[PDB]
Design a protein around this nucleic acid. Structure first.
Ligand SMILES: Nc1ncnc2c1ncn2[C@H]1CC[C@@H](COP(=O)(O)OP(=O)(O)O)O1
Ligand SMILES: [Ca+2]
Ligand SMILES: [Ca+2]
Ligand SMILES: [Ca+2]
Ligand SMILES: [Ca+2]
Length: 379
DNA sequence: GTGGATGAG
DNA sequence: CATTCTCATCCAC
């Protein structure tokens, strides 16, 4: 396969610099509550880190311009514009978070090679960096295939910049793991292509186990408990003991990843399968409060159903108690689903408060720290 | 289907 | 560690 991973540069900060170009010459960070969730490259050179506490950021970089990024409407809107632009190149585009997309270019590459003539194959040319500086063998089929990929990735980024004013990086490789690992080698606004003989050099470069996809905090804790603390430890661990510890498909998967093998296909994401709205806070402790919060969250949600075309057939309420989340969910009554000029707030809040009182014993003190509404089962 | 664990940015 | 504010998959129930 030829796979591309496209990753937008400091995405939230970029959207803000487009929303307000008075900002693009200054160090800029996007704040959510007490965290600077991301910042532009001017800020990073001054020592601002992703997800940095506001106190640390004020002390380190008092010049930092901070814009509030708690409302994701604009980021979400730009995000979908990006994947839909990419869907002009191939029908199958896999989203990861708001600012990453994978595309399987192998169909398109194969078409381009068929169209190619004898004299200008000579004469195929790289777009962007070649990982680890290795030289292209224009006589190697796989090399040619990846170079054509790099040219497409270049056209993708050109379309993005022209149509949307957005800059990002791309990585081109034989699978999703590798494409995503290589896209960030040169940052920001650059692209790199991974040729197969230097794949092993790329996986060697990983310093920590949590740098493998799908190995989060909990999985790393499990592996730590089996004596596996590093990537080489994982490569080196008995497959059969690991299968009898994590399960067959998880063990085989995460072990393949550590040798750079990833056969997962690129899957079309499409529109969200669920919309939610949420807010975190120090204390909710009353039903009256937690009602007003829900009404607010629900109001935002209803604006988004309206946009979208499909109707939710279920609603989910989510809480976080002081000191993970809890949810209940239930079906939305058929008569409420036909809403779109009527009063849907009242029966919807009625349902959500029943869900709330099911989870929270209001006859006794409580103390929430997050509330989310969610619409799912979308038809 | 429902609700919790765990992954992604 | 999560934290933020989302969105997704897996699986016992
Ligand atoms: N739990 C999390 N882990 C990692 N990133 C997160 C998390 N929560 C929010 N984010 C945001 C913070 C940075 C952002 C992705 O990077 P961004 O696009 O801003 O910069 P880059 O140019 O480095 O790709 O994802
Ligand atoms: Ca990014
Ligand atoms: Ca990681
Ligand atoms: Ca989907
Ligand atoms: Ca995480």
């Amino acid at each position: 396969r030829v796979i591309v991973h496209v990753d937008l540069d400091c995405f939230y900060a970029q959207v803000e610099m487009i929303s307000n170009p008075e900002l693009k010459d200054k160090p800029l960070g996007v704040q959510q509550k007490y965290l600077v969730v991301t910042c532009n490259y001017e800020a990073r050179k001054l020592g601002v880190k992703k997800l940095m506490n506001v106190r640390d950021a004020k002390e380190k970089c008092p010049q930092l311009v901070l814009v509030n990024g708690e409302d994701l409407t604009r980021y979400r809107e730009m995000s979908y514009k990006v994947t839909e632009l990419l869907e002009e190149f191939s029908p199958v585009v896999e989203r990861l978070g708001f600012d990453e997309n994978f595309v399987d270019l192998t169909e398109m590459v194969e078409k381009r090679l068929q169209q190619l003539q004898s004299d200008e194959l000579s004469a195929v040319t790289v777009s962007g960096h070649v990982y680890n500086n290795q030289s292209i063998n224009l006589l190697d089929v796989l090399h040619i295939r990846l170079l054509v990929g790099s040219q497409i990735a270049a056209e993708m980024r050109e379309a993005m910049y022209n149509q949307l004013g957005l800059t990002g990086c791309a990585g081109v490789a034989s699978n999703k793991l590798l494409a995503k690992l290589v896209s960030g080698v040169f940052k920001p606004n650059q692209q790199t292509v991974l040729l197969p003989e230097s794949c092993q050099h790329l996986i060697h470069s990983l310093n920590h186990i949590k740098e493998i996809p799908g190995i989060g905090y909990k999985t790393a804790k499990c592996l730590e408990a089996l004596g596996i603390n590093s990537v080489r430890d994982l490569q080196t661990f008995s497959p059969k003991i690991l299968e009898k510890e994590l399960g067959i498909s998880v063990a085989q998967r995460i072990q393949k990843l550590s040798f750079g093998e990833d056969n997962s296909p690129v899957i079309l994401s499409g529109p969200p399968q669920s919309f939610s709205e949420e807010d975190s806070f120090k204390k909710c402790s009353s039903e009256v409060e937690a009602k007003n919060k829900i009404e607010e969250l629900l109001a935002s949600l209803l604006n988004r159903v309206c946009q979208d075309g499909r109707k939710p057939h279920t609603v989910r309420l989510i809480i976080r108690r002081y000191s993970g989340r809890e949810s209940r969910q239930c079906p939305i009554p058929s008569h409420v689903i036909q809403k779109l000029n009527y009063d849907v707030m009242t029966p919807m809040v009625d349902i959500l408060m029943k869900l709330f009182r099911n989870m929270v014993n209001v006859k006794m003190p409580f103390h929430l720290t997050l509330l989310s509404v969610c619409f799912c089962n979308l038809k």
